[PDB]
Amino acid sequence: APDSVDYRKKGYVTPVKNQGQCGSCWAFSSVGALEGQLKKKTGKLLNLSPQNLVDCVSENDGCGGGYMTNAFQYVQKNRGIDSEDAYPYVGQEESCMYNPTGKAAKCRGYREIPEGNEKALKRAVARVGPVSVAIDASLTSFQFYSKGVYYDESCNSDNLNHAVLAVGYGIQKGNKHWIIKNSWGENWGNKGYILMARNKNNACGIANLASFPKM
């Protein structure tokens, strides 16, 4: 477990996307973890399709919400997920238009990080790569974050309302953190990214619903 890990500079991470008004944060989170794992196994970085998941994962609720565990399981049992280009993001619920032709990645299932364990998450991130996580992002301070290690006293580790991607971790001026890729576009936060407090009593429920795909 190195003292600092950032998979953006190891080439595992694609640009920041925009989910729009659709509750598909889970789909981008999952896509992102699969992208990171695709790069690790094959050496190719490629945008995967959140729209495929939104439309085709019945185990979830489309733009109404969903978990990353169900997405990984669907991709596994579907024997594929399309690239972004083969199944573009629209920001709305549609019929499942999965095309085996545009298949860009596969998945042998998923592993879950033990609940509430940031040290376990730390090892998972260091060993596997980008990990899908869920957090409380309902606070005003989160909306208008820009710089620094994000910490807020009112953050509920029980109200998991937003799914994001943990691309690494580190320390900024003594302040331990998680490097978090969001899907609210480049104009949110620090270029679409946010640093969130780490080893600070499971802040925002960062380590409560963490998972990664098997490839």
Ligand SMILES: CC(=O)N[C@@H]1[C@@H](O[C@@H]2O[C@@H](C(=O)O)[C@@H](O[C@@H]3O[C@H](CO)[C@H](OS(=O)(=O)O)[C@H](O[C@@H]4O[C@@H](C(=O)O)[C@@H](O[C@@H]5O[C@H](CO)[C@H](OS(=O)(=O)O)[C@H](O[C@@H]6O[C@@H](C(=O)O)[C@@H](O)[C@H](O)[C@H]6O)[C@H]5NC(C)=O)[C@H](O)[C@H]4O)[C@H]3NC(C)=O)[C@H](O)[C@H]2O)[C@@H](OS(=O)(=O)O)[C@@H](CO)O[C@H]1O
């Ligand atoms: C999941 C799995 O497969 N296993 C689990 C079981 O284990 C747990 O997880 C493992 C895991 O792989 O994650 C275990 O990993 C171990 O984790 C420890 C703490 O979590 C340690 O990691 S760390 O403290 O977080 O860093 C331990 O790692 C050691 O960490 C450093 C250290 O020595 O303290 C590292 O060594 C130094 O590394 C740096 C840079 O990496 C540098 O090396 S180098 O890259 O620059 O070449 C440095 O340099 C030296 O420089 C010279 C010198 O100074 O003299 C010269 O000697 C050399 O060039 C070089 O030595 C290194 N210096 C030293 C002192 O080493 C290094 O990463 C490592 O030594 C890490 N070790 C391993 C093997 O992974 C973890 O311990 C377990 O907690 C277990 O799970 S359980 O939950 O624990 O129960 C079982 C259940 O029974 O389940 C399994 O699946």
